[PDB]
Ligand binder design. Structure first.
Ligand SMILES: Cc1cccc2c1nc(-c1c(F)cccc1F)n2Cc1c(F)cccc1F
Lengths: 558, 427
């Protein structure tokens, strides 16, 4: 029925006008299909006849499926929607199962003919006029306009939710122990009453809605838990992701790898361990959709391993405000981190991962702090507060690093949890030129056009080396130089460079890079007792720039 | 109550439409405070619940007032300000008194409550809409729009200006020496009197306003022996820019001079005209780093000379009111942060440093929030406008904690840097 609800005043974008789209006459097969429907809708108030004074029109269609015994009126509003004002975005935020609080009893209620029960703003009705096409030429023109929320208009979900929320208050004002969640046309009612005293309330609510014209066909609220909503499987005391069936193909198209990674990410919010490192690398293409991106060998062990974890289903629990929130993080591989949030010993609230592809060079600690940050934001959205962290890092390691890092940082309450691998700084640079230690004046340089370069050094003791390199850049050579010095020096060395690039990468104390050169260099530093790096202005002739920068003339010059 | 006043018609800057900014997620504690504050505002007719036909949005936050007595709602009108006030910088602009910086003492008084009594033009309310968020997206969000001039919107002071100038007359006559400047929700009061006389004319002023209606929060360092300096008193005298030191040594090592050739090679961008001609030659050999090599006289002539070209500033001083002020901050050492305000790179209109060492509130984010609020207050005093900061911090960390140590009623424009500065140790 039509509710005595107040109508929300609607309006067209500034300087626009009602649609005037053209509708192709249709098979007289479906012109009778419509008339039957519209006659029943008109009887019920939903629509009304007016076409003389109504200069607008929206196309109307008709579709019937054997998966039914009747027809279906369908109207294409996409032109009216183009000229209808904006509304307060319905809801760009869905709850997350792990943040729902333990309830004793839940009951979803379907509220079907939602929209046709809510009136539409008198002044806007005229812009909804559709026209039913006559048999042949016997066209007097039968046209109707809506008096309620149209099934595909832009403001229907918003105006419906708003109206439903006002209908509910005089009812939740009298029934304080009942909590209600709105979603599309579903009402989920929750409470802490004995299932007996609960079904009585659900009935009162049904009668309340019934007085407002809204029907809850659900007699007794006959909906079935587990509830399946937004890809979730929700039980009365546990939730989980809906079944994840990873296909088994012989050849994978770039599109098949996506849906694959898609599911693997979705499942990661509760299955500990899922890995996406290699199945994700593959998609490094410029123009591809069917490009038979050939599955690699490492990407092959990954897909198998996730299939193994997906083996036995896992469940997570709901939230209890009286307990604490805790999140633990452990290092998975290189660049990958996993974590779980819980209130108790072994029943996770939710799971998750964090990977870092920020260019390529980052520090194990910098990554941990980032992981802590990503979790913190999530907790704030889901539970309204921050968890206590359990982290595989010693208060000393951490403090040494933040105290010396150029960026300001923060991390809530956290405790150490000894669990390998353990986060730590594999090497520290000295802050003062070492005395007695040899001094290497390092230099490198490549020819951009030819890709031929050289790396070298000259020490104070007269030691010299120059090695020719092919297929290189001014940055590989600049690091090759530092690498040669580290290779020919004793356990304590003083190195001088002109390169701000190389000084930065190393000062950042990286550990397991996506470059074997930097890994070769890292492996050296760790082996050294004391290393001290220093930087001086590139092309402004210094000792290093005059001696170490002239031996590079055994190729290209100027 | 029922105090009718014709409303000043406010209009958006043509072409532009109302704001639609996303509301950051808030903690339950802060949400509870917002709904309590907001419910009172609604009984008093200050704000009204709105429907879905209003698509606009402006972020809201909750911050603690002085001493942490109780919560305060802070509306982030940066976007709305940019869509309006930029042309309420023209139509109802408020002139900036160039002598406020010369005063010996400046107090800052919160005069924001005044606004809540002047009704806002009805066709503009719509644009002030804000949403108190819901935890975990369980409920829609409570939605309101303002019925009266709001507090952090630059049009409020532009409109109350009339009432202000009037209320203040009797006092500007009895006190022609004292400079008074209004910025957003604050009154900036400056004089050259003694800190004991000044603090006296300030509460004289407080009572004059109160005598006429407006209110203003009280101190704590006079009657109840409150361990705190909460009532802002600045002294634009001690303000100076000389963090550019050169190491004064007796034993010059190769390392030492190398660094010096470096700092001097950077300084060379700010002050065209200082070169390392002679120093960049005593380093022409490939010697051990730690090998003393006490400068040749020619060098000492270049070092001595440079030690000076610094204290003598560049042209630079060209404050173009048509440009924006940019502020960069660099985490220095332990509890120390340097900063530079400019409009064109390497042409500093001002430089400084800030410090309250990591011990009591040994937090990084807390210091950064403090330095951002000090650098801003200074800019309001000297140029009558706030700067856009380049904060060395991760965006999300900052968006999560800024509002935990924030004590000011305005919010500056900001952005984040991810690349280390090699402008770090050079001051
Ligand atoms: C413990 C529990 C398990 C399964 C579904 C549940 C649930 N609690 C609510 C709930 C709520 F948390 C607040 C108000 C009314 C409620 F019914 N819903 C319903 C529900 C949601 F609240 C969100 C998404 C799906 C859903 F089924």
């Amino acid at each position: 029925p039509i509710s005595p609800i107040e109508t929300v005043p609607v309006k067209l974008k500034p300087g626009m006008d009602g649609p005037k789209v053209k509708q192709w006459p249709l098979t007289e097969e479906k012109i009778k299909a419509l008339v039957e429907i519209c006659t029943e809708m008109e009887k019920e108030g939903k629509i009304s006849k007016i076409g003389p004074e109504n200069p607008y029109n929206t196309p109307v269609f008709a579709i019937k499926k054997k998966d039914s015994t009747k027809w279906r009126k369908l109207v294409d509003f996409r032109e009216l929607n183009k000229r209808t004002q904006d509304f307060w975005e319905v809801q760009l935020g869905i709850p997350h199962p792990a943040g729902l609080k333990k309830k004793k009893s839940v009951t979803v209620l379907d509220v079907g003919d939602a929209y046709f029960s809510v009136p539409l703003d008198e002044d806007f009705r005229k812009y909804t006029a559709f026209t039913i096409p006559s048999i042949n030429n016997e066209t007097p023109g039968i046209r109707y306009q809506y008096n309620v929320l149209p099934q595909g208009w832009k403001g229907s979900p918003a105006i419906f939710q708003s109206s439903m929320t006002k209908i509910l208050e005089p009812f939740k004002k009298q029934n304080p122990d009942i909590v209600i969640y709105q979603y599309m046309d579903d009402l989920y009612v929750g409470s802490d009453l004995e299932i007996g005293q609960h079904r009585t309330k659900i009935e009162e609510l049904r009668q309340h809605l019934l007085r407002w014209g809204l029907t809850t066909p659900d007699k007794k609220h006959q909906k079935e838990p587990p509830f399946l909503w937004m890809g979730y499987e929700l039980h009365p005391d546990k939730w989980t992701v809906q079944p994840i069936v990873l296909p088994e193909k012989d050849s994978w198209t770039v599109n098949d790898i996506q849906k694959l990674v898609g599911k693997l990410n979705w499942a990661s919010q509760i299955y500990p361990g899922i890995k996406v490192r290699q199945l994700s690398k593959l998609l490094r293409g410029t123009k591809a959709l069917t490009e038979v991106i050939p599955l690699t060998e490492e990407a092959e062990l990954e897909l198998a391993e996730n299939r193994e974890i997906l083996k036995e289903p896992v469940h997570g629990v709901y939230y209890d405000p009286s307990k604490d929130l805790i999140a633990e993080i452990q290092k998975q591989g290189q660049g990958q981190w996993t974590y779980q949030i819980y209130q108790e010993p072994f029943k996770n609230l939710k799971t998750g991962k964090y990977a870092r592809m920020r260019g390529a060079h980052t520090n194990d600690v910098k990554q941990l702090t980032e992981a802590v940050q990503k979790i913190t934001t999530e907790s704030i959205v889901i539970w309204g507060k921050t968890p206590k962290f359990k982290l595989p890092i010693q208060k000393e390691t951490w403090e040494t690093w933040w105290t010396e890092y150029w960026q300001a940082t923060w991390i809530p309450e956290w405790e150490f949890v000894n669990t390998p691998p353990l986060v730590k700084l594999w090497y520290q640079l000295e802050k003062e030129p070492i005395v007695g230690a040899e001094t290497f004046y390092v230099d490198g340089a490549a020819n951009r056009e030819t890709k031929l370069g050289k790396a070298g050094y000259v020490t104070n003791k007269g030691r010299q080396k120059v090695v020719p390199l092919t297929n290189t850049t001014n940055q590989k050579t600049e690091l090759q130089a530092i690498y040669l010095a580290l290779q020919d020096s004793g356990l304590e060395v003083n190195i001088v460079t002109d390169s701000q690039y190389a000084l930065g990468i190393i000062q950042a104390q990286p550990d397991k890079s996506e470059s074997e050169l930097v890994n070769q260099i890292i492996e050296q530093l760790i082996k050294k007792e004391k290393v001290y790096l220093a930087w001086v202005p590139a092309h402004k002739g210094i000792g290093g720039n005059e001696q170490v920068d002239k031996l590079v003339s055994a190729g290209i010059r100027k | 109550p029922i105090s009718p006043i014709e409303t000043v018609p406010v209009k958006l800057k043509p072409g532009m439409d109302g704001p639609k900014v996303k509301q950051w997620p808030l903690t339950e504690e802060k949400i509870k405070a917002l709904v309590e504050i907001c419910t009172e505002m609604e009984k008093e007719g200050k704000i009204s619940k709105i429907g879905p036909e209003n698509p606009y949005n402006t972020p809201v936050f909750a911050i603690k007032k002085k001493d942490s007595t109780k919560w305060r709602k802070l509306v982030d009108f940066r976007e709305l300000n940019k869509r309006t006030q930029d042309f309420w910088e023209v139509q109802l602009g408020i002139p900036h008194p160039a002598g406020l910086k010369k005063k010996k003492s400046v107090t800052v008084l919160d005069v924001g409550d005044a606004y809540f009594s002047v009704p806002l033009d009805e066709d503009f309310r719509k644009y002030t809409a804000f949403t108190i968020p819901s935890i975990n997206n369980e409920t829609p969000g409570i939605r309101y729009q303002y019925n009266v001039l709001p507090q952090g919107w630059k049009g409020s002071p532009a409109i109350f200006q009339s009432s202000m100038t009037k209320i203040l007359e009797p006092f500007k006559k009895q006190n022609p020496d004292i400079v008074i400047y209004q910025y957003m929700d604050d009154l900036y009061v400056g004089s050259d009197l003694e800190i004991g006389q000044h603090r006296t004319k300030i509460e004289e002023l407080r009572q004059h306003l109160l005598r006429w209606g407006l209110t203003t929060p009280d101190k704590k360092h006079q009657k109840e022996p409150p361990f705190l300096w909460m009532g802002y008193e600045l002294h634009p005298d001690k303000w100076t820019v000389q963090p550019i030191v050169l190491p004064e040594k007796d034993s010059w090592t190769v390392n030492d001079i190398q660094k010096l050739v470096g700092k001097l090679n950077w300084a060379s961008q700010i002050y065209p005209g200082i070169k390392v001609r002679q120093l960049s030659k005593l380093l022409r050999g490939t010697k051990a780093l730690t090998e003393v090599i006490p400068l040749t006289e020619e060098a000492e002539l270049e070092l001595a000379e440079n030690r000076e070209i610094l204290k003598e500033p560049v042209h630079g001083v060209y404050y173009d009111p048509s440009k924006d002020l940019i502020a960069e901050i660099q985490k220095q050492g332990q509890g120390q942060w340097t900063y530079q305000i400019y409009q064109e790179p390497f042409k500093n209109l001002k430089t400084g440093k800030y410090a309250r060492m990591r011990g009591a509130h040994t937090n990084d984010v807390k210091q950064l929030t403090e330095a951002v609020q000090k650098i801003t207050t200074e800019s309001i005093v000297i140029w009558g406008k706030t700067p856009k900061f380049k904060l060395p911090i991760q965006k999300e960390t900052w968006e999560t904690w800024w509002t935990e140590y924030w004590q000011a009623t305005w919010i500056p424009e900001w952005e984040f840097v991810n690349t280390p500065p090699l402008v770090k140790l050079w001051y």
